[PDB]
Design a protein around this ligand. Structure first.
Ligand SMILES: Nc1ncnc2c1ncn2[C@H]1C[C@H](O)[C@@H](COP(=O)(O)OP(=O)(O)OP(=O)(O)O)O1
Ligand SMILES: [Mn+2]
Ligand SMILES: [Mn+2]
Ligand SMILES: [Mn+2]
Ligand SMILES: [Mn+2]
Ligand SMILES: [Mn+2]
Ligand SMILES: [Mn+2]
Ligand code: NA
Ligand code: NA
Length: 324
DNA sequence: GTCGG
DNA sequence: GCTGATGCGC
DNA sequence: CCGACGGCGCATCAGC
């Protein structure tokens, strides 16, 4: 927040490009600029100063000059005043409503929370849940509540089977003092990259979590991925409903998976980019050597996060240092 | 929108 | 009824 | 100056 005013402006521009313009590469360009500036250890005094940084170009330096001169941005004022733009941007804050749905609703005169309720019959299950918990999903979860959630999950998982391993990742693992949601990585000895598929490994855990009334709603559920809603038990003041993601991954790909799901998202983009500049392709699952005509080798042996960093020659960064 | 081809 | 096409979130 | 920029699990539904 040395340069908080500039990164806020870039984020808002990013959001417009994704939600209204449906221009995903521009969205990513703005987030890339906002990230590099956030890293930058000096108060930016001019566009020319920012232009020095990778990810910041001609148009963004011009925008930085204007914000710096006036404290605002003409484009953003116009956009914030534009009815269709403003409304599309708003509806996408509902989980389940993306750029296409929002634009479609707006074309139909649906543009507010109240309009959404009046027309709930036009919403799908995920969207109705998103409406239902609209305010709740916009609150942050403080680390104290995160640690209480960590306890319920690890313990209920134990009760399905003591050999399951559940690891909370995302911002919680990066040590952040508050979190957007809860991300849970799951492994079991019976499920590896070979293992011959066993139904209900994730289902068993999801059903227990439901049984103890921790998980209250399902958004999507399959054999490897559950997205849903959860809520700490109330004695007293009802706790807000939270989003929870659970991913079941093959035991022998656990470190790749832990690297990936700890993030951050920008950090992951940065790592896999740097990976290429060393002859490796990283995904959620494997690190593989690359070569000449684009031949990605077999997965290299990994038994620690750190092992991945070595392959690509980065100093090890503790989870706390990947929040980009 | 930005950068490397 | 089905499934390719597409959206959404990550 | 142009083209690349990450891909995937899951849900829904237009068009047969
Ligand atoms: N767009 C994406 N596509 C694929 N993976 C992603 C994407 N964004 C993030 N990830 C990975 C890296 C993140 O650390 C991890 C968690 O995603 P997510 O829960 O949405 O954000 P986060 O945990 O880093 O912070 P927070 O949830 O508190 O906002 O998933
Ligand atoms: Mn109205
Ligand atoms: Mn998270
Ligand atoms: Mn998440
Ligand atoms: Mn299909
Ligand atoms: Mn162009
Ligand atoms: Mn039909
Ligand atoms: Na630059
Ligand atoms: Na949304």
């Amino acid at each position: 927040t040395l340069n908080g005013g500039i990164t806020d402006m870039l984020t808002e521009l990013a959001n417009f490009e994704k939600n209204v313009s449906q221009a995903i590469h521009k969205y990513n360009a703005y987030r890339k600029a906002a990230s590099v500036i956030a890293k930058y250890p000096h108060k930016i005094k001019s566009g020319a100063e920012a232009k020095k940084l990778p990810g910041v170009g001609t148009k963004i330096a011009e925008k930085i000059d204007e914000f710096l001169a006036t404290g605002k941005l003409r484009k953003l004022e116009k956009i914030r005043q534009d009815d269709t733009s403003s409304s599309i941007n708003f509806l996408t804050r509902v989980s389940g409503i993306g750029p296409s749905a929002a634009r479609k609703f707006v074309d139909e005169g649906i543009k507010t929370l109240e309009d959404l309720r009046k027309n709930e019959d036009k919403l799908n299950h995920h969207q109705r849940i998103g409406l239902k918990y609209f305010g709740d999903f916009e609150k942050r979860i403080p680390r104290e509540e995160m640690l209480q959630m960590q306890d319920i999950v690890l313990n209920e998982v134990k009760k399905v089977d003591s050999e399951y391993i559940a690891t909370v990742c995302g911002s919680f693992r990066r040590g952040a003092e508050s979190s957007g949601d809860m991300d849970v990585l799951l492994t079991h000895p019976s499920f590896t990259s070979e293992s011959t598929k066993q139904p209900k490994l994730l289902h068993q855990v999801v059903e227990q979590l439901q049984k103890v009334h921790f998980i209250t709603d399902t958004l999507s559920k399959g054999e490897t991925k559950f997205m849903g809603v959860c809520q700490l038990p109330s004695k007293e003041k009802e706790y807000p409903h939270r989003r929870i993601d659970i991913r079941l991954i093959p035991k022998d790909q656990y470190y790749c998976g832990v690297l990936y799901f700890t993030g951050s998202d920008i950090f992951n983009k940065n790592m896999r980019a740097h990976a290429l500049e060393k002859g490796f392709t990283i995904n959620e699952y494997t690190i593989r050597p690359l070569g000449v005509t684009g031949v990605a080798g077999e997965p290299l042996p990994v038994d620690s996060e750190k092992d991945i960093f070595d392959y690509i020659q980065w100093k090890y960064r503790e989870p706390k240092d990947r929040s980009e």
